[PDB]
Amino acid sequence: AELVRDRQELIDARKKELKAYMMMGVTAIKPLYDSDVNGSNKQAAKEILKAMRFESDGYFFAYDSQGINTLHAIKPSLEGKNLYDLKDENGVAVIAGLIDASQKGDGFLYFSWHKPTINAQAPKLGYAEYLQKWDWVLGTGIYIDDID
Amino acid sequence: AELVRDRQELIDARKKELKAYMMMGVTAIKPLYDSDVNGSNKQAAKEILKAMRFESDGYFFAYDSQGINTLHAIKPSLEGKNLYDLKDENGVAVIAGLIDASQKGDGFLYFSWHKPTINAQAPKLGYAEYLQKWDWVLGTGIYIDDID
């Protein structure tokens, strides 16, 4: 019960951090987002979000409501690909799950994904917010393999 | 000793957060900073940094090595003023202390400053990093009045 409690404390602290990091990304592009005329500023906002880090493994991605990648800080070759049907190694439908979490739920989803610092899959806790003007589900995450 | 220990744990957790937030701000402007030609991109970087928040009280400021404010997210009327001699209510030379912390020390300084959410002075822990190309001591902080 105690070791379980300590783990949940660590998770909850990380969820609070995730909301802060997301706020930083959303506010960093706010001048562009607010002044946008039919997508004129999307390219500029992409360049800012893809540069941002809160640690080596701490980066942004975004997908539209159809599951098409609109930006990826780590693997920009994903941009323009439809990943709606993508499943992780445990059968989690990651992209569909993030779209739904951000729109209909609390923004959070557990799944496995490439982890930059080891170039291999690892368990992650993702957090996404929906930016309706651009139809972007904008997300980031923390890796939980240290806990787990 | 226990209540002292819990306070130090809270402080250290906040210092870790501060380093993350600073990284986000530094990386958000990296494309601009890296491609800058003699200050051409400073204005654009200011607009991004002044919009960023990690909470209502979580924002950026910057001063040059002479103590001249170069950006302030909360009170932009400070920009261009020389605040090198400024002292808080406890006689802490805030601007000189941040310049020195960022250049010669560990980046951290305790001082009191206007806190947005109460529009009044409150104790703060600041963290600054030096960006030499622009001579900006770029900083942010967390308010500690809750602990204290």
Domain parsing of chain B, residue ranges: 1-148
* CA-wise closest residue to A109 among A119, A120, A94: A94
Residue A58 is classified by DSSP as B
Residues B112 and B24: their CA atoms lie apart, in Å, by: 24
The resolution of the experimental structure, rounded to one decimal in Å, is 1.9
CB pairs under 8 A between A and B: 55
Residue A85 is classified by DSSP as T
Amino acid at B109: L
What is the crossing angle of helices A2-28 and A42-51, to 10°?
Answer: 140
Strand B69-72 and strand B108-115: pairing? unpaired
DSSP lists the bridge partners of residue B137 as B63, B130
B98-103 long-range contacts (CB < 8 A, ≥24 apart) are: B98/B63, B98/B126, B98/B128, B98/B137, B98/B139, B99/B63, B99/B65, B99/B67, B99/B128, B99/B137, B101/B126, B101/B128, B102/B128, B102/B129, B102/B130, B102/B137, B102/B139, B103/B65, B103/B130, B103/B137
Amino acid at A31: P
Question: Quick check: A31 and B13 CB within 8 A?
Answer: no
| Nearest residue of chain B to residue A53 (CA atoms) | B24
Amino acid at A1: A
Residues B27 and B38: their CA atoms lie apart, in Å, by: 19
Residues B23 and B81: their CA atoms lie apart, in Å, by: 26
| Nearest residue of chain B to residue A18 (CA atoms) | B54
Residues B93 and B111: their CA atoms lie apart, in Å, by: 8
All residues of chain B having their beta carbon less than 8 Å from the beta carbon of residue A23 are 53-55
CATH annotation of A1-148: 3.30.450.20
Say how many C-beta atoms besides its own lie within 10 A of residue B23's C-beta.
17
Kindly give the residue spans of alpha helices, DSSP state H, lying in chain A. Answer: 2-28, 30-35, 42-51, 94-104
All residues of chain B having their beta carbon less than 8 Å from the beta carbon of residue A17 are 17, 20
The answer to whether B110 and B123 are in contact (CB under 8 A) is yes
The answer to whether B57 and B124 are in contact (CB under 8 A) is no
Say how many C-beta atoms besides its own lie within 10 A of residue B82's C-beta.
13
Residues B82 and B101: their CA atoms lie apart, in Å, by: 18
What is the crossing angle of helices B42-51 and B2-28, to 10°?
Answer: 140
- B35 burial class (0-12, 13-18, 19+ CB within 10 angstroms)? exposed
Question: Quick check: B27 and A51 CB within 8 A?
Answer: yes
* CA-wise closest residue to B111 among B85, B79, B88: B88
Residues A57 and A74: their CA atoms lie apart, in Å, by: 9
Residues B88 and A112: their CA atoms lie apart, in Å, by: 48
The answer to whether B17 and A13 are in contact (CB under 8 A) is no
All residues of chain A having their beta carbon less than 8 Å from the beta carbon of residue B28 are 24, 28, 48, 51-52
Residues A125 and A107: their CA atoms lie apart, in Å, by: 10
Method for structure elucidation: X-ray
Question: Quick check: A28 and B48 CB within 8 A?
Answer: yes
Mutate to test the interface with A, among B21, B47, B54 (most CBs of A within 10 A): B54
Residue B59 known to bind ligand: yes
